[PDB]
Amino acid sequence: FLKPRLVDIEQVSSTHAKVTLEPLERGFGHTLGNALRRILLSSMPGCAVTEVEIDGVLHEYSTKEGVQEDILEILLNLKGLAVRVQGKDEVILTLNKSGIGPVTAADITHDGDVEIVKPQHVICHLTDENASISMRIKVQRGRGYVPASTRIRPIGRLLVDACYSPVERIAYNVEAARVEQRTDLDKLVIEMETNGTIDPEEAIRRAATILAEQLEAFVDLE
Amino acid sequence: GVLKIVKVYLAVKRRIQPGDKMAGRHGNKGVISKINPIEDMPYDENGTP
């Protein structure tokens, strides 16, 4: 049995990448592709936002004066914010902005361990230059989808839904690969669509590590 | 017969779940059966479930 090795991590965009596997025996390509796709779409580490506090507002059904968008819409916009923390599993982000103009994610005060993948993301629009907005964004590390109802104190804190999942679209194809003279060798290429927080090769490595760890359940160590 | 009247407005945010009724426009009503995981749904060639 030939051992698959990762040869290309070719990226066509910041959020789109294709990872190819050159050597594969017949029948192994589809098995590995399906298992990898399921284990990537299922469980990957993410860094979605969990909490948000705004000084003016009390409950997320209110409206802030001077802000174009509703507070619920602001929370929904924040839910899609993609951010990666490379040093901590918890961080507090502060956003301060004043004057007329859209409030983009680039306006968030940033630390060394926190970076924004797409600064062009917009949070809310300020229509009156007198009005100002301030937030305390709380970011946690997790996996899967954790609804805001299943958390298990102050009035000011606003709870948002948490969906820690860097990947959102995985597709794979099995193609014939020519190695030396023998045929039946298959090449598996996996096309990924992340939000930019998780590297492709690291994602494949983590997914395969989880798959190998789970295989030890019904087999002795090998 | 009453001194003061107090009205309290609660605002509960519903979410879809099995048992809810969902319907199209051409009279094809139905009830939600299972919230299938994202990876279990059928996907086309490009990988979109």
Side-chain angles (χ1 to χ4, degrees), chain B:
Chain B
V2 49
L3 321 173
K4 71 209 298 183
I5 286 185
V6 168
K7 286 176 181 293
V8 176
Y9 284 62
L10 303 178
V12 49
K13 196 199 294 288
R14 304 290 199 203
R15 233 162 67 248
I16 205 75
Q17 59 186 345
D20 281 76
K21 201 166 154 185
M22 256 177 44
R25 262 179 306 189
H26 308 84
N28 45 4
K29 58 203 177 298
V31 73
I32 301 304
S33 179
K34 185 174 184 282
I35 319 289
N36 219 21
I38 178 62
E39 65 268 42
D40 288 347
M41 271 310 208
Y43 66 101
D44 49 355
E45 199 139 357
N46 287 113
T48 65

Side-chain angles (χ1 to χ4, degrees), chain A:
Chain A
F1 278 151
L2 297 189
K3 288 304 162 314
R5 318 293 193 96
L6 203 163
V7 289
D8 290 298
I9 320 103
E10 193 264 336
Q11 282 195 354
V12 304
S13 184
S14 181
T15 171
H16 203 264
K18 309 159 75 149
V19 169
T20 84
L21 281 307
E22 202 58 78
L24 269 177
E25 286 271 9
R26 207 177 65 76
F28 276 94
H30 264 281
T31 299
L32 267 192
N34 193 14
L36 260 289
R37 170 187 188 273
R38 278 184 67 82
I39 203 160
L40 279 168
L41 278 179
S42 201
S43 57
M44 291 295 288
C47 216
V49 58
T50 297
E51 224 48 79
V52 51
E53 298 100 357
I54 314 190
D55 36 359
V57 76
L58 318 98
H59 53 113
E60 77 268 19
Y61 297 14
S62 150
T63 76
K64 215 186 144 46
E65 190 268 343
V67 176
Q68 214 278 343
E69 297 183 356
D70 204 88
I71 286 281
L72 201 44
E73 209 204 313
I74 279 167
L75 262 59
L76 258 59
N77 280 324
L78 274 162
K79 213 184 74 182
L81 169 70
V83 60
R84 49 189 317 277
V85 189
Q86 54 89 14
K88 298 308 284 174
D89 45 355
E90 257 271 359
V91 81
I92 284 292
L93 292 176
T94 312
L95 165 70
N96 287 299
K97 179 86 194 302
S98 284
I100 292 185
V103 174
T104 64
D107 301 343
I108 291 184
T109 308
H110 101 291
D111 308 274
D113 41 352
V114 171
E115 80 195 284
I116 304 329
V117 283
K118 42 171 312 205
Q120 327 161 50
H121 188 81
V122 314
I123 286 176
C124 68
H125 304 265
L126 262 290
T127 79
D128 188 64
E129 83 293 330
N130 174 327
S132 100
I133 200 173
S134 306
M135 281 166 228
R136 266 90 63 195
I137 320 286
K138 187 166 178 287
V139 172
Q140 298 177 170
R141 284 273 298 258
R143 90 199 186 266
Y145 167 78
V146 183
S149 86
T150 73
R151 291 287 123 183
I152 312 301
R153 300 287 199 273
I155 309 283
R157 295 173 73 240
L158 305 166
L159 263 76
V160 314
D161 262 37
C163 43
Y164 330 99
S165 279
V167 301
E168 55 197 6
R169 211 185 47 86
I170 311 282
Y172 63 95
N173 330 300
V174 197
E175 310 159 357
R178 180 51 46 227
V179 165
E180 206 267 338
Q181 186 272 345
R182 86 171 324 283
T183 75
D184 256 3
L185 258 282
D186 291 339
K187 163 166 91 121
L188 172 63
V189 314
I190 303 169
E191 158 191 312
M192 283 173 70
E193 186 100 273
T194 77
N195 53 21
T197 59
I198 283 288
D199 304 284
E201 197 266 301
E202 208 278 336
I204 290 299
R205 183 140 284 138
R206 265 185 194 156
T209 296
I210 296 150
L211 181 54
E213 269 184 8
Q214 217 89 358
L215 274 184
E216 287 322 297
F218 39 57
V219 70
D220 198 72
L221 284 179
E222 82 278 36

